[PDB]
């Protein structure tokens, strides 16, 4: 079908790189043709998968974040869940590889809002945290970008070692980060 | 020198054309050598590439040995190190062949082993900063090895996932400030 493609494309982009998987591989792997595949281009197809996963993850987060009473806990839990989740973070190396290629100003308007979904989770947390008076952050957008990028760092660059080690580190991080604010 | 020339030539080939594009044939003929010699020294292209990365790690470590004199205190060394890691990758030419390589073999497990030995060397930079910082009462960290792994991966996330260079530096410096503050 049409959305037999998006599922296989996703799995290819994870299995191999952005560059390593091509429009020939995906079309061949879905019993289709370039007529079918023509989405616009590879860059769009990819960027649409990015859209799906980023939503799926933020939705999974919203249906799991009630378990965090304070925002201070929401920070730990969000970063913690990021290690375990099935969404978005498994596409990160392809996202790294993708940035180095496309540069092109046509598509990078779309990178502006998808870079802002990525950080909004923290923005909500730090803003609602200043409303709740758990901390005094004057520079939230700065901090939201930092925390987001740190965490993706730990998730991505530790994807090999034991999952409890990873979860241990990530929690020690959140502890050191939040303590840094006060 | 036929080992070092191969690594030299390999490096520049990898830079110009990328990892996947560079063939051992090229590496062989351009360094005035042979498949035999390349096999004897590196076995694979993958391993050759790792040996390059090894030499690069060493040089980075030698650079940092000299650069860290600009930081009297470890608080300062922490700030600086992270900044260098950010600024130097903005114009690090191998970075593309690395990304290519990393993603091409992070599925593969044997390669994944030796990469650890390599990343571990990069973490030591922080281990030393944090160790020495304990001994001068800059902070009190019980779990140094941990916080060193943490620092390293957080810093490299900020570097890898981010637009004008000043804002980046200002951000990274904020992170260093926040992180370093939350140990008191
Ligand atoms: C004049 C500047 N000189 C250097 C700058 C460098 O910048 C680097 C930036 C990086 N990222 C920024 C996005 C990464 C990942 C590795 C880098 C290395 C590096 C490359 C291969 C193996 C190890 C390292 C290394 O330094 O340690 C990591 C194991 C590196 C090496 C040198 C000599």
Phi then psi for residue A160, to 5 deg, are 180, -55
How close is the nearest chain A Cα to the Cα of B30, in Å?
Answer: 27
Per the CB < 8 A criterion, the answer to whether A2 and A36 are in contact is yes
User: Domains (ranges, CATH) in chain A?
Assistant: 1-46 (1.10.10.60), 47-182 (1.10.357.10)
Per the CB < 8 A criterion, the answer to whether B48 and B42 are in contact is yes
Rounded distance, CA A159 to CA B106, Å? Answer: 9
How large is the C-alpha radius of gyration of chain A? 18
Query: CA B88, B93, B94, B96: dihedral to nearest 10 degrees?
Result: 100
Is B100 close to A97, i.e. CB distance below 8 A? yes
The token duo for A3 is: 């959305």
Q: In chain A, what residues touch B104 (CB-CB under 8 Å)?
A: 17, 20
What DSSP string runs through B29-49? HHTT--HHHHHHHHSSHHHHH
What's this structure's resolution in Å? 2.9
| Interfacial A residues in 105-144 facing B (CB < 8 Å) | 139, 142-143
Q: In angstroms, what is the span from residue B99 Cα to ligand 1's centroid?
A: 12
Residue tagged 């608080």 (tokens)? B75
Q: How far is CA B89 from CA A57, A124, B61, in A?
A: 30, 31, 15
Is B158 close to A160, i.e. CB distance below 8 A? no
Is A19 close to B100, i.e. CB distance below 8 A? yes
Contacts by residues B20-26 (CB-CB < 8 Å, ≥ 24 positions apart): B20/B100, B20/B104, B22/B97, B24/B48
Is B178 close to A173, i.e. CB distance below 8 A? no
Secondary structure (H, E, C), chain A = CCCCHHHHHHHHHHHCCCCCCCHHHHHHCCCCCHHHHCCCCHHHHHHHHHHHHHHHHHHHHHCCHHHCCCHHHHHHHHHHHHHHCCCCHHHHHHHHHHHHHCCCCCCCCHHHHHHHHHHHHHHHHHHHHHHHCCCCCCCHHHHHHHHHHHHHHHHHHCCCCCHHHHHHHHHHHHHHHHHHHC
**How were these coordinates obtained?**
X-ray
Q: Does A15 touch chain B (CB under 8 A)?
A: yes
Query: CA A109, A111, A113, A115: dihedral to nearest 10 degrees?
Result: -150
Phi then psi for residue A61, to 5 deg, are -70, -45
Q: Does A19 touch chain B (CB under 8 A)?
A: yes
Q: In angstroms, what is the span from residue A11 Cα to ligand 1's centroid?
A: 30
Q: In angstroms, what is the span from residue B92 Cα to ligand 1's centroid?
A: 7
Ligand 1 pocket list (CB less than 6 A)? B 53, 56-57, 59-60, 63, 85, 88-89, 92, 95, 118-119, 121-122, 159-160
Is A176 close to B156, i.e. CB distance below 8 A? no
What count of other Cβ atoms lies within 10 Å of the Cβ of residue B151?
26
């Amino acid at each position: 079908l049409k959305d037999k493609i998006l599922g296989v494309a996703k799995e290819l982009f994870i299995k191999n790189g952005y560059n390593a998987t091509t429009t020939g591989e995906i079309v061949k792997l879905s019993e289709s043709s370039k007529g079918n595949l023509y989405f616009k281009t590879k860059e769009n197809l990819f960027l649409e998968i990015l859209n799906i996963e980023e939503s799926k993850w933020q939705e999974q987060w919203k249906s799991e974040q009630i378990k965090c009473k304070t925002n201070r806990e929401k920070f730990y839990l969000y970063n913690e869940l990021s290690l375990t989740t099935q969404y978005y973070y498994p596409l990160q190396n392809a996202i790294i590889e993708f940035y180095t290629e496309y540069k092109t100003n046509s598509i990078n308007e779309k990178m502006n809002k998808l870079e802002n979904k990525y950080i909004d989770a923290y923005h909500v947390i730090f803003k609602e945290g200043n409303l709740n008076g758990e901390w005094s952050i004057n520079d939230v957008n700065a901090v939201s970008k930092i925390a987001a990028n740190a965490v993706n760092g730990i998730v991505t660059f530790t994807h090999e070692q034991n999952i409890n080690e990873r979860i241990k580190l990530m929690n020690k991080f959140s502890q050191i980060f939040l303590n840094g604010l006060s």
